[PDB]
Amino acid sequence: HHSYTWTGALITPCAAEESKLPINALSNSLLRHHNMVYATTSRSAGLRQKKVTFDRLQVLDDHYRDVLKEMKAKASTVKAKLLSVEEACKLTPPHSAKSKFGYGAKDVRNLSSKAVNHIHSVWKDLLEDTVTPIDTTIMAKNEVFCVQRKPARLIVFPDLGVRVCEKMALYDVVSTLPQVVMGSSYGFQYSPGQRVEFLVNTWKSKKNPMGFSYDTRCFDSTVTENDIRVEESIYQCCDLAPEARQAIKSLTERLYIGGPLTNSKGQNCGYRRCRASGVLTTSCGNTLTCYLKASAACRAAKLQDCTMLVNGDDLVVICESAGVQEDAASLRAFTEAMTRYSAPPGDPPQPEYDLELITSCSSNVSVAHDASGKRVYYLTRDPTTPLARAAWETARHTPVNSWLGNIIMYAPTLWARMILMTHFFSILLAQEQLEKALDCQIYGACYSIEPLDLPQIIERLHGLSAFSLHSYSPGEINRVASCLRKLGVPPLRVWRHRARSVRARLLSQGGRAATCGKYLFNWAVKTKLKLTPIPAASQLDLSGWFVAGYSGGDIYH
Numbered sequence: 012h013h014s015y016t017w018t019g020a021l022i023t024p025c026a027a028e029e030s031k032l033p034i035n036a037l038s039n040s041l042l043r044h045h046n047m048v049y050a051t052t053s054r055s056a057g058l059r060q061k062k063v064t065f066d067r068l069q070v071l072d073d074h075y076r077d078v079l080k081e082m083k084a085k086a087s088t089v090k091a092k093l094l095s096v097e098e099a100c101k102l103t104p105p106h107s108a109k110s111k112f113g114y115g116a117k118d119v120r121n122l123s124s125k126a127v128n129h130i131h132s133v134w135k136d137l138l139e140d141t142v143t144p145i146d147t148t149i150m151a152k153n154e155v156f157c158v159q160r161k162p163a164r165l166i167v168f169p170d171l172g173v174r175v176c177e178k179m180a181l182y183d184v185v186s187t188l189p190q191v192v193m194g195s196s197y198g199f200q201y202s203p204g205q206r207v208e209f210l211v212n213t214w215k216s217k218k219n220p221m222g223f224s225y226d227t228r229c230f231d232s233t234v235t236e237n238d239i240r241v242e243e244s245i246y247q248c249c250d251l252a253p254e255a256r257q258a259i260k261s262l263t264e265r266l267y268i269g270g271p272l273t274n275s276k277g278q279n280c281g282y283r284r285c286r287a288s289g290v291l292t293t294s295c296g297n298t299l300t301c302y303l304k305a306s307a308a309c310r311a312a313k314l315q316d317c318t319m320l321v322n323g324d325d326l327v328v329i330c331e332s333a334g335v336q337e338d339a340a341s342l343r344a345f346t347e348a349m350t351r352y353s354a355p356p357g358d359p360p361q362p363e364y365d366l367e368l369i370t371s372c373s374s375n376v377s378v379a380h381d382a383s384g385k386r387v388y389y390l391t392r393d394p395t396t397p398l399a400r401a402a403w404e405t406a407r408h409t410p411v412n413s414w415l416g417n418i419i420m421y422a423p424t425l426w427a428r429m430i431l432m433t434h435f436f437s438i439l440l441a442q443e444q445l446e447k448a449l450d451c452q453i454y455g456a457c458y459s460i461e462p463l464d465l466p467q468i469i470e471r472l473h474g475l476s477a478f479s480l481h482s483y484s485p486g487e488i489n490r491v492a493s494c495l496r497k498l499g500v501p502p503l504r505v506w507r508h509r510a511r512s513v514r515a516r517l518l519s520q521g522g523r524a525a526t527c528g529k530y531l532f533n534w535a536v537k538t539k540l541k542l543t544p545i546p547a548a549s550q551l552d553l554s555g556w557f558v559a560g561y562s563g564g565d566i567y568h
């Protein structure tokens with residue numbers, strides 16, 4: 012029951028790949044230790060193939076089936092609709108991978124006859140054939156990190172025509188089902204501020220809280236044919252059109268369960284019998300399966316009053332403590348149960364009795380103070396990867412602007428405000444590009460965002476306190492400072508000076524630009540303004556943000 016089998020053909024690049032951090036005139040203003048930053052390339056694909064290839068064994072007990080029955084009962088309340096061809100086309104990112112059948116993402120978005128005809132033919136074929144595995148392409152991802160190097164992650168995805176069909180059959184399902192099945196445990200329904208609120212309120216709801224994150228080793232590879240069929244059985248609990256039931260059955264049999272892997276040059280690389288990382292159902296499937304396995308494991312371990320928080324393969328559990336010794340024993344039992352279910356750990360879990368010490372989705376809860384001096388909880392993370400990616404983006408235009416996504420998601424943090432806002436608004440000003448919409452990703456979905464709208468977005472998501480936080484925790488301050496020394500980033504005095512300059516120039520522009528100056532950089536001046544609500548904020552349609560996760564699912568808004 013191997014996760015993959017391989018022919019020996021190589022995983023190949025579809026374009027020239029750079030590993031070394033590109034440098035321009037702006038690089039040193041952000042960081043000096045350039046050799047610390049790198050991008051992964053296909054040259055390490057082989058190392059990744061070795062790590063992701065293993066046999067899976069699965070022993071399923073009564074706890075597992077009990078939880079599954081409960082999940083199905085909730086799923087049976089869901090009613091889901093097919094998307095029209097047009098609706099599905101409009102969810103396609105403008106720069107999504109072109110089809111091998113003579114049309115591209117722009118053709119799809121424009122409803123061109125060629126694209127629409129092909130999409131219709133793929134759909135008809137899904138209804139007519141529920142057996143033949145569907146081809147997929149395997150690629151090595153090019154992602155940027157700071158040293159201590161990782162081998163490239165792999166991405167596996169079907170052709171554009173198939174991706175459009177996935178949306179038609181399953182977009183409504185994967186957008187609505189998880190919150191119904193998992194309720195408050197479904198992580199993607201929360202903005203960062205809402206996630207912090209759920210965590211804190213959950214922590215406070217326990218008499219003696221204990222919590223832990225659980226890291227499954229190579230989660231996608233641990234997902235078995237059983238797991239993927241169980242996921243389909245959950246989808247089929249929904250009230251669906253018969254046409255939708257057939258398309259979903261077909262996609263499960265032909266795509267989700269496994270299929271051939273083809274490299275960028277059309278060679279057969281091998282065969283997958285685990286989760287594909289680049290299909291619409293990757294996020295929802297991982298979320299449901301992680302939740303199922305973990306909920307059953309809690310019962311096997313006899314953890315008391317477990318509250319889970321699940322985002323794909325990312326898992327946090329907060330429960331009622333039974334004592335330090337009992338807690339540690341129960342956690343080992345939990346891990347043993349997860350392992351029997353084919354979800355063994357990478358790092359062994361550790362019980363935590365301080366909420367701020369739990370890291371999940373690479374983030375943690377921390378505390379600062381607003382202008383009135385009151386304690387405010389917010390979401391932060393180690394800034395190392397955000398800053399390394401920011402350095403790459405300083406010198407190269409890339410498909411996704413991580414710096415923009417990070418400012419949005421981590422707006423209240425010491426590091427995003429001091430460094431990312433300052434650095435990138437300086438660059439935007441110099442190039443007169445403040446109004447140019449840029450692509451970023453939020454929970455895996457792609458969004459086109461004008462940087463001038465940032466103050467409203469931030470106020471809607473985080474509230475006005477995001478612009479006045481100060482007196483950060485010693486732990487957070489030290490982590491940021493350590494990162495700055497590691498990468499060779501300039502000191503606070505430098506950033507404050509640059510911020511005052513950026514702010515001054517923004518104010519002189521008037522309009523939204525002045526709003527950016529006033530709100531984003533109020534922290535940098537001696538005599539601070541008392542910030543009030545931004546009128547146009549109400550106008551933004553953020554209904555669609557923070558509904559569901561779409562990592563790998565080729566979704567655009």
Ligand SMILES: CN(C)N(c1cc(C#CC(C)(C)C)sc1C(=O)O)C(=O)[C@H]1CC[C@H](C)CC1
Pocket residue numbers: 424425428429480481482483484488491492495502503534
């Ligand atoms: C108290 N004063 C000196 N601070 C302030 C500066 C801090 C720092 C730092 C290093 C990581 C460079 C060591 S923490 C902090 C703190 O407020 O805890 C502020 O006013 C900050 C408010 C937020 C803004 C983005 C940057 C300045």
